[PDB]
Design a protein around this ligand. Sequence first.
Ligand SMILES: OC[C@H]1O[C@@H](O[C@@H]2[C@@H](O)[C@H](O[C@@H]3[C@@H](O)[C@H](O[C@@H]4[C@@H](O)[C@H](O[C@@H]5[C@@H](O)[C@H](O)O[C@H](CO)[C@H]5O)O[C@H](CO)[C@H]4O)O[C@H](CO)[C@H]3O)O[C@H](CO)[C@H]2O)[C@H](O)[C@@H](O)[C@@H]1O
Ligand SMILES: [Zn+2]
Length: 241
Amino acid sequence: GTKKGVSAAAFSGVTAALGDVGARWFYTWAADPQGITAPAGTEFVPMIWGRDSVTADQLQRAKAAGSTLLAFNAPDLAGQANMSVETALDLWPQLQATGMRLGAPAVAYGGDTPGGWLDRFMSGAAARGYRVDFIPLHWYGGDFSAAATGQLQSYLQAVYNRYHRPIWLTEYALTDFSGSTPRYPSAAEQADFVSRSTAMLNGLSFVERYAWFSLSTSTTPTGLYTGTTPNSSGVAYRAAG
Ligand SMILES: OC[C@H]1O[C@@H](O[C@@H]2[C@@H](O)[C@H](O[C@@H]3[C@@H](O)[C@H](O[C@@H]4[C@@H](O)[C@H](O[C@@H]5[C@@H](O)[C@H](O)O[C@H](CO)[C@H]5O)O[C@H](CO)[C@H]4O)O[C@H](CO)[C@H]3O)O[C@H](CO)[C@H]2O)[C@H](O)[C@@H](O)[C@@H]1O
Ligand SMILES: [Zn+2]
């Protein structure tokens, strides 16, 4: 019912796609829907992406566009928000001052690692008396077998066990980035993982929300829909609770 969402971008048919797949919520990596008209029953969640995303105007835009706030995207990656724990802590009061339910920055990896980016952020927030309501995560599996769903579950459990905040999974797919270019599963491998991973997540009481990366093949080869047509993975996501 309540957990299943998606990342999305404006394309011809986005509204129908969101409706047909049964998304309860969506985000755009921006402070507003970036031209997308949401179907009825589909909640937009704003994001404050990076350092230069933190202005009065963006924070007010976000608060008018929704009731929950996602903080910086992959601050631990040079190619994304690319930010120190200290820069993220120093901007935090501006995000807190909106009064919105507030999600931690979403780390690319290492969320459970002592001394990692997330651990220093949460440790510093607690010492400053800051509020962090939930922890959003990213996960991309390189093992394309039936074992993948268990590997994802282990990472989510470890982050819950470390910080005891409710968990969102705001990007997930099978993709191996270890090599010089990305490596993807066969279509049948992907659809089996969609089924087994959603069943696992729908039943895990400390996961509040999840978002397959991503709605549309025009964003990523792991896309669920081309225009308004679902592939076997979109079919599997639509059939999830
Ligand atoms: O200071 C750091 C950099 O600041 C930049 O300017 C900011 C500007 O980039 C930002 O615009 C938004 C885009 O960042 C955003 O792009 C989304 C991607 O972040 C996302 O990346 C995922 C990633 O999270 C995951 O780990 O790996 C995925 C798989 O490889 C990867 O794809 O992908 C999304 C899908 O393509 C993509 O949309 O999109 C937003 C929505 O359009 C943009 O708003 O906005 C900021 C202002 O609010 C700018 O400060 C500079 O360009 C850089 O030079 C700096 O290094
Ligand atoms: Zn400082």
